[PDB]
Amino acid sequence: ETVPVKLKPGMDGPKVKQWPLTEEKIKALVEICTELEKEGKISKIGPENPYNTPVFAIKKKDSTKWRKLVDFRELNKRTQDFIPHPAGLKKKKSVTVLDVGDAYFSVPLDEDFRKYTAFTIPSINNETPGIRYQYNVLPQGWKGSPAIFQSSMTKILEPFRKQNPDIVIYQYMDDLYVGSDLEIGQHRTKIEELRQHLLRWGLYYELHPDKWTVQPIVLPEKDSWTVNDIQKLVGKLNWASQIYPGIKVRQLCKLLRGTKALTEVIPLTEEAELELAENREILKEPVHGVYYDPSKDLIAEIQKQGQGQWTYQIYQEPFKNLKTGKYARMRGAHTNDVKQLTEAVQKITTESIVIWGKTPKFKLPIQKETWETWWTEYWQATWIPEWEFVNTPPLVKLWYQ
Amino acid sequence: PISPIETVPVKLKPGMDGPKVKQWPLTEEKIKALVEICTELEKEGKISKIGPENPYNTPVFAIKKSTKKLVDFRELNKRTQDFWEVQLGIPHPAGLKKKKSVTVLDVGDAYFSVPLDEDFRKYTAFTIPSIRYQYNVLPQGWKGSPAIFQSSMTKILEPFRKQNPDIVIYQYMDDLYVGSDLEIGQHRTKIEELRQHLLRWGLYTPDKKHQKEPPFLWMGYELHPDKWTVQPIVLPEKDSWTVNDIQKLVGKLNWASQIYPGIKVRQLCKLLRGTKALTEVIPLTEEAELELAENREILKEPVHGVYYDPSKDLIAEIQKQGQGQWTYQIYQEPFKNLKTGKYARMRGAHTNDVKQLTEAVQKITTESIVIWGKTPKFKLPIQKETWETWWTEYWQATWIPEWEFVNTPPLVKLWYQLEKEPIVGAETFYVDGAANRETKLGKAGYVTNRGRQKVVTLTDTTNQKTELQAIYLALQDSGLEVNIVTDSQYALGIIQAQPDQSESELVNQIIEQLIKKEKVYLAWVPAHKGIGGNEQVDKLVSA
Numbered sequence: 005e006t007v008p009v010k011l012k013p014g015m016d017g018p019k020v021k022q023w024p025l026t027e028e029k030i031k032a033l034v035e036i037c038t039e040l041e042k043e044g045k046i047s048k049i050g051p052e053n054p055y056n057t058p059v060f061a062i063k064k065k066d067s068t069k070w071r072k073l074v075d076f077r078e079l080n081k082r083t084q085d086f087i088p089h090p091a092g093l094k095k096k097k098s099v100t101v102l103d104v105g106d107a108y109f110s111v112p113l114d115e116d117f118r119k120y121t122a123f124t125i126p127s128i129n130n131e132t133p134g135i136r137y138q139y140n141v142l143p144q145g146w147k148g149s150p151a152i153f154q155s156s157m158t159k160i161l162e163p164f165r166k167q168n169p170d171i172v173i174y175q176y177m178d179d180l181y182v183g184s185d186l187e188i189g190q191h192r193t194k195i196e197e198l199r200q201h202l203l204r205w206g207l208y209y210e211l212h213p214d215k216w217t218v219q220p221i222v223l224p225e226k227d228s229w230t231v232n233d234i235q236k237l238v239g240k241l242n243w244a245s246q247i248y249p250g251i252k253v254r255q256l257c258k259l260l261r262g263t264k265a266l267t268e269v270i271p272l273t274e275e276a277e278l279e280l281a282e283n284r285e286i287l288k289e290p291v292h293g294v295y296y297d298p299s300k301d302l303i304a305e306i307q308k309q310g311q312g313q314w315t316y317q318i319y320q321e322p323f324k325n326l327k328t329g330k331y332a333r334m335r336g337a338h339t340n341d342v343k344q345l346t347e348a349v350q351k352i353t354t355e356s357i358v359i360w361g362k363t364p365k366f367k368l369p370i371q372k373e374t375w376e377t378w379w380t381e382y383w384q385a386t387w388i389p390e391w392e393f394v395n396t397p398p399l400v401k402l403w404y405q
Numbered sequence: 406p407i408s409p410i411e412t413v414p415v416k417l418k419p420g421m422d423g424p425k426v427k428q429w430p431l432t433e434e435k436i437k438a439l440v441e442i443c444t445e446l447e448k449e450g451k452i453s454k455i456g457p458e459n460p461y462n463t464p465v466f467a468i469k470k471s472t473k474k475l476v477d478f479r480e481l482n483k484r485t486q487d488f489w490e491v492q493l494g495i496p497h498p499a500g501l502k503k504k505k506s507v508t509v510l511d512v513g514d515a516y517f518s519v520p521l522d523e524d525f526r527k528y529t530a531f532t533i534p535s536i537r538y539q540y541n542v543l544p545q546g547w548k549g550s551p552a553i554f555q556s557s558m559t560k561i562l563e564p565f566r567k568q569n570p571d572i573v574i575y576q577y578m579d580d581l582y583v584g585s586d587l588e589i590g591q592h593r594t595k596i597e598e599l600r601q602h603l604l605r606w607g608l609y610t611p612d613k614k615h616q617k618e619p620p621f622l623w624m625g626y627e628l629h630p631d632k633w634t635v636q637p638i639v640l641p642e643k644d645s646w647t648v649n650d651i652q653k654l655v656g657k658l659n660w661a662s663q664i665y666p667g668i669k670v671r672q673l674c675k676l677l678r679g680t681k682a683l684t685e686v687i688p689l690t691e692e693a694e695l696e697l698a699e700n701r702e703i704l705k706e707p708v709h710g711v712y713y714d715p716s717k718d719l720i721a722e723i724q725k726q727g728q729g730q731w732t733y734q735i736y737q738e739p740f741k742n743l744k745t746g747k748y749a750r751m752r753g754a755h756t757n758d759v760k761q762l763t764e765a766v767q768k769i770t771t772e773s774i775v776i777w778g779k780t781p782k783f784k785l786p787i788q789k790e791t792w793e794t795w796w797t798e799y800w801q802a803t804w805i806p807e808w809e810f811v812n813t814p815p816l817v818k819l820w821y822q823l824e825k826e827p828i829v830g831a832e833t834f835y836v837d838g839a840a841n842r843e844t845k846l847g848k849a850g851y852v853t854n855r856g857r858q859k860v861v862t863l864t865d866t867t868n869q870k871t872e873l874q875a876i877y878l879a880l881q882d883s884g885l886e887v888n889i890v891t892d893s894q895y896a897l898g899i900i901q902a903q904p905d906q907s908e909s910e911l912v913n914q915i916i917e918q919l920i921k922k923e924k925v926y927l928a929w930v931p932a933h934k935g936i937g938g939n940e941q942v943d944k945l946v947s948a
């Protein structure tokens with residue numbers, strides 16, 4: 005049978021529109037889509053269905069195979085409401101991620117809700133009308149899916165949980181998060197073990213939580229200080245003063261009284277030396293009393309430092325960061341800000357799941373057109389977060405550098 | 406011409422309900438026209454009689470002047486559910502691939518040949534003033550007819566498409582362009598197979614005798630199956646020129662700027678200043694007579710292009726045609742263009758050629774992906790070095806697809822660079838600016854390590870305006886090198902961004918000074934703190 009489902013009061017189905025895709029991506033979606041038609045997963049629809057959501061194709065970890073990906077961000081917000089996230093997982097030692105989108109194909113979708121899932125495959129140069137289809141079973145990427153299929157999920161995970169009662173399994177949309185403390189060899193296998201147990205009903209990258217913190221701010225150490233040098237330090241210090249209110253700068257400012265040359269080297273009094281020492285000592289730890297509020301939204305802001313570096317901060321309330329960090333590089337595409345920014349977005353969303361089990365609202369230092377033209381060329385997750393574009397201040401970065 | 410095609414289920418918006426509009430009691434003069442019309446119509450299948458059960462009704466008319474019927478369904482439209490948008494984007498010449506032959510079938514009264522949802526069918530009721538009838542096919546001008554017809558059309562072609570994969574069909578409006586690579590006899594033959602096929606499902610199309618001939622005009626171009634052309638347009642001449650007149654000329658010349666070079670409309674455009682009415686007559690000036698001439702010649706040269714060849718690389722080259730303006734062309738064989746265009750001087754709050762060039766590229770890449778589903782290899786008037794230098798010093802994320810340098814002045818460069826560190830032996834100015842928010846009265850100025858200093862009163866100003874002013878002064882009154890320290894993170898940003906183009910008079914005056922200097926180092930400090938230097942100017946620009 006099929007459990008009924010509805011949109012929230014007053015809401016109507018999405019009517020977003022289809023971005024154009026490259027040739028390579030269209031061909032692939034046709035192959036993929038025909039097959040699913042043969043199997044009765046999807047059905048061509050009429051012009052009497054006015055709804056629509058965008059779709060595209062990605063490559064995964066490394067295969068030559070493509071994966072269909074539908075952006076239900078919108079449909080999800082309009083879908084009605086319906087586990088209690090495991091504090092453990094985060095404190096674990098090694099989490100591997102598995103894609104279970106499949107399981108949903110084995111379940112019928114209440115036909116009244118089906119129209120809402122309509123989507124369209126484009127055609128090059130508009131020579132052909134698009135190809136329209138709507139889902140007949142539970143569709144990957146949708147919010148309702150994981151819910152409606154939990155009764156079955158635990159049921160199958162029932163045994164393995166019992167067997168290994170010290171490994172944590174948390175689910176998020178199409179992903180399954182498994183965490184243990186075993187040797188990174190008998191860990192990698194216990195996983196596979198599941199890969200097979202999981203494959204008896206029918207389905208088919210090592211993270212490391214213990215090192216995700218709120219990295220400390222540092223200050224420059226100098227041989228000899230100059231006016232420029234001091235001014236700069238006062239600038240940064242002043243900023244930080246907002247977080248740590250006990251930070252002082254009366255003694256450092258005193259050294260600048262006058263209207264001197266910018267390069268003029270200045271000697272540090274014993275007073276300034278103290279101020280520094282103290283300030284340095286106040287910054288050896290994150291600020292006090294910062295706690296996660298679940299009746300608010302997670303926010304993530306990112307700065308570009310250059311040379312392949314990017315810094316970020318996840319917070320709920322200004323100046324009270326829950327976590328901060330930096331993402332760089334490891335052997336890949338030598339120079340493509342866009343690729344890097346996408347990757348960075350994925351890394352951050354992941355943690356926000358591991359820890360809090362929800363996605364953060366991004367603030368991207370880039371331009372809409374640039375972002376929308378290319379991000380898909382490098383995406384890799386079954387999920388997609390929310391985001392907006394901005395004009396990064398000057399300090400902000402200088403501060404985190 | 407009734408169709409054996411399954412119908413599309415329809416419904417009225419939720420809550421809404423069928424029309425029940427009265428029926429005019431017009432003369433029997435027109436009646437007999439209707440009686441007949443509707444009868445053949447009836448026995449043609451298109452309509453059917455009814456009676457007691459259909460309480461819905463829409464006004465029907467009979468029209469004389471065509472010297473030999475018009476039902477109005479507006480009220481039924483704002484009742485019908487919404488349908489899926491009909492293809493709004495359409496093919497562009499440069500996207501097609503060459504053919505041996507091309508024919509265009511004319512799906513005439515395609516509309517009236519398609520069934521109407523038996524269910525929904527009732528609401529299309531209308532009575533002939535003293536017979537009740539019902540529509541059975543898609544009515545002229547009814548909300549869903551376009552959308553529904555196009556689809557039905559799509560189905561009917563499905564098989565045929567599968568079996569003749571080397572054949573290519575384009576549905577548009579009431580048209581079917583079909584081209585191929587077969588021989589002229591074979592091609593003629595296939596077409597006739599389509600006709601019958603369509604004929605098979607109740608959709609009639611004229612024959613090879615009553616057709617339409619190549620080339621075909623498509624949004625400005627003339628199309629042959631082997632190549633395309635742009636009909637040389639005409640610019641009338643006369644004494645009388647209304648504003649309206651002049652506006653139109655500008656429009657035409659403007660579109661041709663895309664295809665033809667050296668087209669200009671400035672002096673011809675500076676002719677609408679002040680105009681009081683569209684019927685007003687502006688005396689054509691001289692430069693506006695001279696320009697109008699140069700354009701006429703240039704417009705006499707014919708322009709020929711070619712189609713797309715899937716087995717060849719795509720390549721775009723761009724040019725700096727003056728500030729904010731750019732030109733581009735795309736080809737596959739040197740000299741043989743596919744398409745070319747122009748981008749009007751985007752004008753912002755502050756940018757530079759490197760930033761601008763970046764957008765042009767982006768726009769072209771978006772364009773390309775839609776025409777060909779690919780992106781060309783770029784050839785640009787910029788140094789690879791210039792690009793690496795900007796890439797690292799800029800905060801926003803930025804990128805350019807594979808490209809290669811093409812020395813071809815004017816190249817696009819950076820008009821000035823900021824020092825990464827302060828300068829030894831250069832004067833040092835501390836500048837400030839303050840303005841009241843209730844009176845908008847302000848003060849700008851500076852102090853230096855060389856004794857000197859200046860202040861300046863302002864009117865109708867603001868915090869960011871005066872703050873920028875202080876900087877201009879300093880830049881203005883000094884040697885070829887300088888160290889400048891301001892407390893406005895606002896003004897820092899604008900400049901840190903090495904802008905070279907802007908709409909603000911002041912920003913430009915500054916950009917100019919900046920281009921001049923030999924070395925410049927801009928520095929920032931918190932405002933209103935103790936910090937020496939800053940607390941001097943702080944005091945002088947207050948009152």
Ligand SMILES: Cc1ccnc2c1NC(=O)c1cccnc1N2C1CC1
Nearest residue numbers: 496501502507573575582583584630
């Ligand atoms: C107007 C139009 C729009 C889209 N495609 C075409 C046409 N018309 C043609 O004349 C044509 C010319 C060259 C290549 N394809 C063409 N055809 C395709 C059908 C063979």
